[PDB]
Each structure stands twice: as structure tokens, then as C-alpha cells.
Ligand binder design. Structure first.
Ligand SMILES: [Ca+2]
Ligand SMILES: [Ca+2]
Length: 328
């Protein structure tokens, strides 16, 4: 039927990547079970979620170092069950007092939560503050924090039940939605997505970017002062856009992508998924500039999900494999 060709475009079933090489890339020692999301503070500290599964941890890298090493951040507190910790998307928020909050999408079992931590820098540890859950956060993929416990969140499925959501994805229902959460108000701000994944915000707070993974699109929304979102632009791509990072200096989007959906969603060690990184400049203009900055067939890095730049270097994460650190 027609649902056979649509599945095949959605999952990019025969796409092969055109490699783009970077001359000094090195695998990050210590990252072998995923680096699904990451975020770099202005001071050069990078948080990385790992062990994402569908043992989990949050890693730290000081990118001001010449050969930065990963350390595992210890979770401090008695309000979180560490043994089920299964981190996915992350976000940070830095308050007036310079407190660094880390928000972490957690999937303990088949439920979704958002965990709030306070970064304790001197101790290199995470103080757990709060577990957030809500009817309108059924299947969280990523969030972008706009306060210590305020965020926009993507739900990449409508259903929670793993069997139902498997079906919803194969059918292409496109029922995934985006939710604004705050202590005072929780509501849906956009809906109808074919798997909303990455989400982020312009440095001036005026725009929100949402990755629609299986539609291969990035949506730009106007963010009003009352936290409402209104559609503004839709950019289309030939690749499965996953997590979005934002360079604070330029506002550029840096995007980790899966060139082929079959190889990322139906794993096969003899045919691993590759990696692909997009830079997007001037997203509001008539012709946004889209550059493939890095791409490979997975011989080195399999299943890139996220990429961000700090002072000439590019850090690339993956859903379940390694992480790559490159000169631009
Ligand atoms: Ca994120
Ligand atoms: Ca993902």
C-alpha cells in the first residue's frame, strides 16, 4: 500500500552517507555505552548522559583541557533511586546566584520522569532535588530548561505502553507532542509530530527549535512571554535529525543526525549505523545555510545523536556507542 512507501521515506531505508572528514578526531576514552545527549556550559564544562537504554550515568568533561578525560558524576541524595537511573535528554539552567541546574530525562522502567539536580562543581557531583512526572509527560525524549524546574519537553510517542508505541511508530500516527512544564502550569504547546526528539532555544529566548525525527524536519517556533509557542518556519532535510545544540555566540544550530533509520532502529553489528552532523546558520532567513560538518559510515562512530562546539572543537555523542572529539 502507500503506507509501505511512506515508512520507507520516513526511515531512509536505502540512504547511504556521503563522508565528510575532519583531520584530527579522537574517540573519548571511557565512553563505550552511549553518549546520547550532552550540553556544554559557557565555562567549557560538558555534561553527557550515558548508558541510555530503551548502568546509566551522567559524565563530565572539562573541554578547556588539552586531552579532556571523562569522570562519572556521583549522584548525591535520598530522593532518587539510582539503581533504575536511565538518562536520555538533558538540559542546564544557570540561575542568578550562578547555581547550575541539570535537568535529566529519566526512563526508570517504562515510565518517564524529568530529574532535577544541582551541580556541585567543587565536589564534581550531582545533588538530586526533585523527580518530576505528569500526565502530559508520557514519553519524554529531551527538554530545554528555562528555569530550575521549568522546561519545554518533547514526547516522542503518545502512548506509554511499549507495545502500543511500537505500533504507533510503524503506522506513522504522528501523535507525538511538546509540553511546557512549570510549577504553576503544565500544558501542551505543539502537537502532531512524527517523533519529536531534540529541542532547544535561541540565546535570546525568543525562538524554540524542535526536531521531528521521522519527518526529517526542524521546526522553529516563536516563544511568547506567556510561554506559548507559535509556528514560524519548518526546515526539511534528507536525514533523521535527532538532538539540537545551540552555539550561544552565533545562535547556530548543531545537529546530530542518523542518515539511515533502519540501521539505527534495527541494529545489526555487521551493518552498524553511521553518523552525520549538521550546522544550520541564519535559521530565520530565506535560505538557511546548512553544512554537513562531519559524516561517516560508522567505522569509527556509530549512531550520532548530538554534537556541539566549544572553542574550535566538536564533541559528538551517540545513542549507545562511543563519543568523538574533533578539531573543526
Ligand atoms: Ca538536550
Ligand atoms: Ca534520541
Amino acid at each position: 500500500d502507500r503506507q509501505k512507501s511512506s515508512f520507507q521515506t520516513r526511515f531512509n531505508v536505502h540512504r547511504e552517507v556521503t563522508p565528510v572528514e575532519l583531520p584530527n578526531c579522537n574517540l573519548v576514552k571511557g565512553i563505550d555505552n552511549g553518549s546520547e545527549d550532552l550540553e556544554i556550559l559557557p565555562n567549557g564544562l560538558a555534561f553527557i548522559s550515558s548508558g541510555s537504554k530503551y548502568s546509566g550515568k551522567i559524565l563530565l568533561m572539562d573541554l578547556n583541557e588539552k586531552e579532556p578525560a571523562v569522570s562519572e558524576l556521583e549522584i548525591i541524595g535520598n530522593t532518587l533511586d539510582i539503581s533504575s537511573f536511565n538518562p536520555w535528554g538533558i538540559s542546564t539552567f544557570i540561575d542568578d546566584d550562578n547555581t547550575v541546574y541539570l535537568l535529566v530525562v529519566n526512563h526508570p522502567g517504562s515510565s518517564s520522569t524529568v530529574e532535577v539536580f544541582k551541580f556541585q562543581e567543587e565536589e564534581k557531583s550531582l545533588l538530586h532535588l526533585k523527580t518530576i512526572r505528569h500526565k502530559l509527560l508520557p514519553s519524554v525524549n529531551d527538554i530545554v530548561a528555562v528555569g530550575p524546574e521549568h522546561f519545554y519537553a518533547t514526547n516522542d510517542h503518545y502512548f506509554i505502553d511499549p507495545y502500543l508505541k511500537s505500533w504507533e511508530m510503524h503506522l506513522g500516527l504522528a501523535w507525538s507532542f511538546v509540553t511546557y512544564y512549570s510549577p504553576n502550569d503544565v500544558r501542551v504547546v505543539a502537537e502532531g509530530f512524527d517523533s519529536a526528539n531534540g529541542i532547544n532555544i535561541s540565546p535570546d529566548g525568543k525562538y524554540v527549535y524542535i526536531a521531528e525525527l521521522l519527518a526529517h524536519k526542524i521546526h522553529v517556533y516563536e516563544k511568547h512571554a506567556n510561554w506559548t509557542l507559535t509556528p514560524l518556519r519548518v526546515l526539511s532535510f534528507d536525514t533523521l535529525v535527532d538532538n539540537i545544540s545551540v552555539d550561544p555566540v552565533t545562535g547556530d544550530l548543531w545537529v546530530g543526525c542518523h542518515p539511515n533509520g533502519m540501521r539505527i532502529f534495527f541494529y545489526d553489528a555487521e551493518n552498524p549505523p553511521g553518523s552525520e552532523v549538521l550546522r544550520i546558520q541564519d535559521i530565520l532567513s530565506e535560505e538557511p545555510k546548512v553544512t554537513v560538518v562531519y559524516a561517516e559510515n560508522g567505522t569509527v562512530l556509530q549512531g550520532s545523536t548530538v554534537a556541539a562546539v566549544y572553542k574550535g572543537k566538536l564533541l559528538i555523542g551517540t545513542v549507545f556507542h562511543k563519543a568523538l572529539y574533533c578539531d573543526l
